[PDB]
């Protein structure tokens, strides 16, 4: 047992999240309902998290301790002690970039205050209530201005290109990625 100290906390990077997770959970099934063995590769899946019963794979090819580091070819389950089923984390590959609620609605709205853009606007954006003009090229339009449906419509017809506006968490990610922290610090 290690003797540690100083607990460190930080934002989870997507590569770190992939680093911890051992498998992607693609289908929602939980268990086989006939024999309650877990479904692959569902929310409970042995080939991702671990064997249900100590030192025996799911399919039952290897049951002796003689096999303890081998990974059954039929069922992609490694043979270990069931306690591992308590520590392995999984992951889901999300299709649409989604905003983290805590960094949004907590009284100091860190998405809000980082963007120097009011909170009401951001809620409107994430829930697909309005677009926002993300770097609207050579036009008469600001970079963090929210636009209603018909404003975006007359704009697109009016400004085909050099016109970037979006909706939702995707737009917010775009706005966040392009921001120059230190230069704005100097200006401010």
């Amino acid at each position: 047992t290690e003797e540690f100290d100083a607990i460190k906390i930080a934002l989870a990077s997507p590569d770190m999240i992939r680093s911890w997770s051992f498998g992607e959970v693609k289908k929602p099934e939980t268990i086989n309902y006939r024999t309650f063995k877990p479904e692959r590769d569902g929310l409970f899946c042995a080939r991702i998290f671990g064997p249900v019963k100590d030192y025996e794979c799911l399919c039952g090819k290897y049951k002796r301790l003689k096999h303890r580091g081998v990974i059954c070819e039929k069922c992609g389950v490694e043979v270990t002690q069931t306690k591992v089923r308590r520590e392995r984390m999984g992951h889901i590959e999300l299709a649409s970039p989604t905003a983290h609620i805590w960094f949004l609605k907590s009284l100091p709205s860190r998405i809000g205050l980082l963007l120097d853009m009011p909170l009401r606007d951001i809620e409107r954006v994430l829930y697909f209530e309005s677009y926002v003009v993300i770097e609207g090229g050579m036009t008469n339009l600001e970079r963090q201005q929210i636009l209603t449906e018909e404003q975006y419509l007359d704009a697109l017809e009016e400004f085909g290109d050099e016109f970037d506006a979006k909706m939702g968490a995707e737009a917010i990610q775009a706005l966040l990625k392009s921001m120059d922290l230190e230069q704005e610090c100097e200006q401010l």
Binding site: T30, Y33, M138, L156, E157, E158, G160, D161, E162, F163
Partner: protein
Amino acid sequence: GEIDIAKRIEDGINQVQCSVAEYPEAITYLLEQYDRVEAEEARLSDLITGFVDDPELAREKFAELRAQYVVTRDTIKATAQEEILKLSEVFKQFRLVPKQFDYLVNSMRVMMDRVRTQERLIMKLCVEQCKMPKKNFITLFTGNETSDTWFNAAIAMNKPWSEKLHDVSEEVHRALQKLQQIEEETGLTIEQVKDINRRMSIGEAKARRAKKEMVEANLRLVISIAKKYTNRGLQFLDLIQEGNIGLMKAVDKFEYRRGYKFSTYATWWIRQAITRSIADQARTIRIPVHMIETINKLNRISRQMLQEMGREPTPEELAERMLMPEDKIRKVLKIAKEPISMETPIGDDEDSHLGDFIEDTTLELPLDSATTESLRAATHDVLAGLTAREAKVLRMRFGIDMNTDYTLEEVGKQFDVTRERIRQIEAKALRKLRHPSRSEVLRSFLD
């Protein structure tokens, strides 16, 4: 709507085709890939995909493109430019192989972006000291946008930041020179790209409206049919979404020439999708659909028999009503039970939930661990009490203080005497330990 919206889709891409044609040297590459297409190594639908306002037909239309283009090309340097715009509109009918438009629209987009990067660094320079309204930037920069003349036009207006820009005169001229290279590949200026981009957007918006209509026309129908399935553990909105998927599937698969009522076809697919989704993803533990139908039958039968009889039908009576052997009746009844929420509060003691009671049976009992330890210690010393190589035999035959156990032949190989003699050794050792006063202390471990 599918054919209508496909026509409008092609009309939008056709508009981007016109936009490209009205742009220069585009006609050169255009005719080049028409020449490529003539060899017939591709399809007619990579060059024309529905008109706007056979190899021979394309050949003659492109001959007319060549003729009008060249004749206006000689006198191109007034009205001939409007005639080239007209050629762009008549070619609007044609659409080029996806790769070529991807190449041009992407190079033009990234170049507009690059010039924009230069412009934005300039806009930083202006906003920090002089706060340049964008109107003058456009007007002075737009119109030429090709030579560095606008730079000295910014120098010519005597503005303090504009003249101060000599700090970034190097980068500005690098941007203008690369811009000149883009000019050469196009062989023109920019502003007409602005015209081009606005027409592209207009066409795409037309197509957008058509696609919108492709459900605006059949929307509320999904909602109407959806309100049926409204209590099978499914957020109403998921229901309407599944219905939308089914409706789209029907529309794309709808056949007016097969002889079949459209609305029925639609509703059919709607149900086929909605019921399938509820059957599969409703219950936590997914269950075959025929089993669900079995539950439905059971529930109808229970209702009828109960409301007529008054009391209720006993599982025997249900087994009567249906021909199933009733073993599956109670099997289905067991399966239907939904999992209870682990937090359900226990009576008048909202302090503990159900989760607070479930015990973990996996845990090996500490008593048993102590027993096992004592047992290993005692067996080790008692083996030490017996002879050396017999002791090693018995350790190897089992997993005592060792890993995987080898069968008798392999241990015999380990002694190089590999045969029934090894089991003779095993039986003799067992016999020798049978004698009491040594094993009784281990006899205690039985119970």
